[PDB]
Amino acid sequence: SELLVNTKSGKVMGTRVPVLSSHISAFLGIPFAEPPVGNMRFRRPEPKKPWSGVWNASTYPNNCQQYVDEQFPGFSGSEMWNPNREMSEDCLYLNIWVPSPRPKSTTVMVWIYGGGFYSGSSTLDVYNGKYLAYTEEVVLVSLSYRVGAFGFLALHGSQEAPGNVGLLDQRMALQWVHDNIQFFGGDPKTVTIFGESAGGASVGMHILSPGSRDLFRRAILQSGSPNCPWASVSVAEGRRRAVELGRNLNCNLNSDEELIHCLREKKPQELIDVEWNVLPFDSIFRFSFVPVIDGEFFPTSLESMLNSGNFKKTQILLGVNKDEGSFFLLYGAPGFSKDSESKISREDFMSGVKLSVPHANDLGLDAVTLQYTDWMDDNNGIKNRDGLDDIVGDHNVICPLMHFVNKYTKFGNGTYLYFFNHRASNLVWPEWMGVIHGYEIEFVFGLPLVKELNYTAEEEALSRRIMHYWATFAKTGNPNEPSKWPLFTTKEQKFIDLNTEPMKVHQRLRVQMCVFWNQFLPKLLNAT
Amino acid sequence: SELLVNTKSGKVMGTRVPVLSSHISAFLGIPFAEPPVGNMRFRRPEPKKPWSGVWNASTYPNNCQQYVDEQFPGFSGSEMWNPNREMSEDCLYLNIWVPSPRPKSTTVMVWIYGGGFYSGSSTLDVYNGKYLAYTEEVVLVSLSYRVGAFGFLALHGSQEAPGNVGLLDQRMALQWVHDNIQFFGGDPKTVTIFGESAGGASVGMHILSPGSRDLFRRAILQSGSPNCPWASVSVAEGRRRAVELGRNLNCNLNSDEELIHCLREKKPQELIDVEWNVLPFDSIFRFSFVPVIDGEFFPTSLESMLNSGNFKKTQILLGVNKDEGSFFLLYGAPGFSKDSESKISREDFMSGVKLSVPHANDLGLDAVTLQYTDWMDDNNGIKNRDGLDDIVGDHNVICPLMHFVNKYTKFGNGTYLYFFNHRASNLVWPEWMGVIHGYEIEFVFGLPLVKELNYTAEEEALSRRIMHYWATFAKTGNPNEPSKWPLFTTKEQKFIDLNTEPMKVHQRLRVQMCVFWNQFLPKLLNAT
Ligand SMILES: c1ccc2c(NCCCCCCCNc3c4c(nc5ccccc35)CCCC4)c3c(nc2c1)CCCC3
């Protein structure tokens, strides 16, 4: 039977699912780790003990314990990112969509979800792998991983809560794909890991981590990179946050053992209820529990690793959206609201830059403000809104990614860069937010192919284009079928726009601003 | 007789001069001070002792001792600024052009020449007052003043070489105009002082100095302002340069008296031969002997005087040219030459910014470079040439003037701002230099009215326009005859272009760059 597969860990039974009036098989909720519960919380994951009998893989698994966004109750725009399954600490599962009939040895794609390392689920509707699996004849895998404190509480030196365990959850699911995807028709010599936001940062982290490099072939990073200012912290900062988390729950703070033991007796929701209270600064686009530069998962600082070529050398395809920042200003900056055009005053602009570059002194805040202000029209509410939007996006997503691509390209075997700037026709978010963080995903997963979702015909055409680029690149290391997406080189630095208009090639993506964020500002904050 | 005038110091005999096929009287070389020679060198000027008999004022006087530019021998472009009379320390004279028939009580204009406080003459052909005197029915005066070490050697505390004596020469000639211009038909209640470059800075200095304020009514500043970075130094820096001047002549350096006595036994040319060796940095647009903030001529720092309204409150008319910087790069920056288009390499660009902002550390030099570099086209030789040109002009002329106008306007009684960007048709300098420092003077003095000088008819029309604005403003405090040059206000900040095209009004002259030069860079150099 097509829905029964014997793996090294046991047999799993899938279910047949309909897709654009055809069908493919889906194996949902396959376990790849022992439930990280009880004394296991905060700890490195353990491989799932083999089982006898047949595992029922016909329904989605629980999503990991996470903060639930309640800003716009029932609003689909934000509801679409929240968990759509009961949450549970028992959440280490993976999902597989397999073309039908079952392939023999085809291209594999492993999706790693974003959500700032504090949230995220593999079961969201925009992450439904059936359309891509089906349209491109690829075996699609979506893994899961512990987020929030459960995944990233870091007390370096201790072995009970070492940090980075959520990264290790990902690595384990990747080890499982490596060990068992052959039974589902997947070629393990050809797996592409791809992810968005924290997922895109994660992908880059596996490219850097020696212990992860051999478990995959190629990589795709969407609006995220490992060196993002919000994606990692030092062991000292990780320690200070774990301790403050402890102080918020009236835990005994005399030893790592006392702290950890106390954190383990707490219900999941108690940790989530105070998670945000440990951030050191008033900020926007910063998360409490994230990966730590520990000397193990990351042997040295990310920058020295990038400088010395200390990373997996292969091909990569990556990019950013036009307005990465709008979503974070809506959520935490004064003057922005979902139902107005959000014209910002100079005062709110300035409190906006303070929030956006939390780690900056007055001279640095003055440098950002001068760089983004049109002084012939300083009180233009729309220019202030838009400037703040670019500040958030440039600093948090775009410029860190450009610094990663330029460092990678000096040693890699091929880079393809994209700029996604299509504002979808059925977007339910206000116009001022533009091409939002996360809104290229639906095109990558091919949602515009389903009529009922109201996209235009040209949007369906763009989706097919992107899906075919993503899968052709996963299969060959080049998105083009043998109109060309030029290779990004150290010299020319070419990239493409990804929208419904005819393809245009440009060069040096936001160089002007990125020289400021990658070379000038860091130097300024170092001298003063 | 029309050419004989009795003044409080004695009788002077002028000469009749032809002007655009008419005639006016000229009194040249009238003395207003005792020759500052021998033991008088470096000292405050003494009023000229009255004489009996008739002073022959029919020919130009000697020009003060100064460095003579020999870069382009015989080239008119640069030759036109060099002394056209024998040089002599006996040079404190003034010149008067009087309409004919002699007026009774008309508007007076007193010209103060530029030349970086180290050079300059009142007798240059572009400074010929007959055209303006004649066309606008104004009594035109051009004064002279000691330059170089002779005018600005500063050993604060000593009374033999106190500093600022060249400023005091100007003040004395102004006291003479106040005391005697009535006999030439001039109204002393209505004298406008106007000057260019160091002359424009000088004008602003008399506006600030309590001891000069009562000697004039209105002021015009062309491409220069008192707060320019090259127009003044502290008493300590002035002292260090006087001492180094001394060290260059093997003078005894044990006391001010020993130093001064030694400097006084030296021939004029010995001082000029080593004048440039005392500059502290390798620089462009910096001069050795300039005014000092001494607590006497300037009671406190220029900025605190500007902040508190401590200055003469009246009307002012001022402006800058499009390419103030080109001339100084031609003379001292690598890669520029008179006979080539001067496309600059990145290396020369960078050595150019170091020369232009001599007082800056590495972080500051990086800030200037980022502000003026198009990073999508960093190796464009023309963009590098042009960027360096704006850097010199913005930092040395334009942004200091805009900071002065904005501070002045908060207390003054009327401001009129201009931007001169007409490239004259007969210019002998290469195209790349644009609208050069000093090339608006010929229009102010009306040289385009004389056919033989080859200007176009529209250039003649512009000259008449400017002359009429300058004189109407000197007579009334407003350049418009009762198409309007709007008043520059603290709120609107309006200004006009001054060229052959129809008048256009704009706002906030180079705000973007001036916020960088007036507010950001100074703060950055202060913190680091
Ligand atoms: C843990 C985490 C956050 C917390 C928090 N604010 C922060 C709440 C932010 C909720 C946004 C939902 C994400 N949802 C989104 C995603 C994407 N795009 C989006 C685009 C638009 C809107 C939401 C998006 C791309 C993929 C990743 C997910 C706060 C608190 N606790 C927290 C405890 C206590 C009260 C103060 C605020």
Ligand SMILES: c1ccc2c(NCCCCCCCNc3c4c(nc5ccccc35)CCCC4)c3c(nc2c1)CCCC3
């Ligand atoms: C004293 C002063 C300068 C010296 C110097 N370099 C510097 C020499 C510069 C000569 C330029 C002539 C001005 N002449 C000019 C003026 C205007 N515009 C111009 C526009 C173009 C060209 C010249 C101009 C506007 C009004 C003011 C005058 C040097 C030395 N000594 C000096 C000793 C020793 C050798 C090294 C160079």
Ligand SMILES: *[C@@H]1O[C@H](CO)[C@@H](O)[C@H](O)[C@H]1NC(C)=O
């Ligand atoms: C698998 O689980 C689902 C959902 O709980 C159930 O409806 C289905 O019948 C199960 N199949 C088997 C054979 O266990």
Ligand SMILES: *[C@@H]1O[C@H](CO)[C@@H](O)[C@H](O)[C@H]1NC(C)=O
């Ligand atoms: C990738 O590597 C192959 C073989 O090692 C080499 O021939 C090819 O040029 C490389 N491609 C790029 C873009 O570096």
Ligand SMILES: *[C@@H]1O[C@H](CO)[C@@H](O)[C@H](O)[C@H]1NC(C)=O
């Ligand atoms: C004035 O001086 C000039 C030049 O030296 C001379 O030619 C002229 O005749 C003189 N006039 C008188 C009366 O001194």
Ligand SMILES: *[C@@H]1O[C@H](CO)[C@@H](O)[C@H](O)[C@H]1NC(C)=O
């Ligand atoms: C100048 O002063 C006069 C009288 O003191 C005043 O009425 C007028 O408004 C002033 N003009 C400006 C532009 O300040």
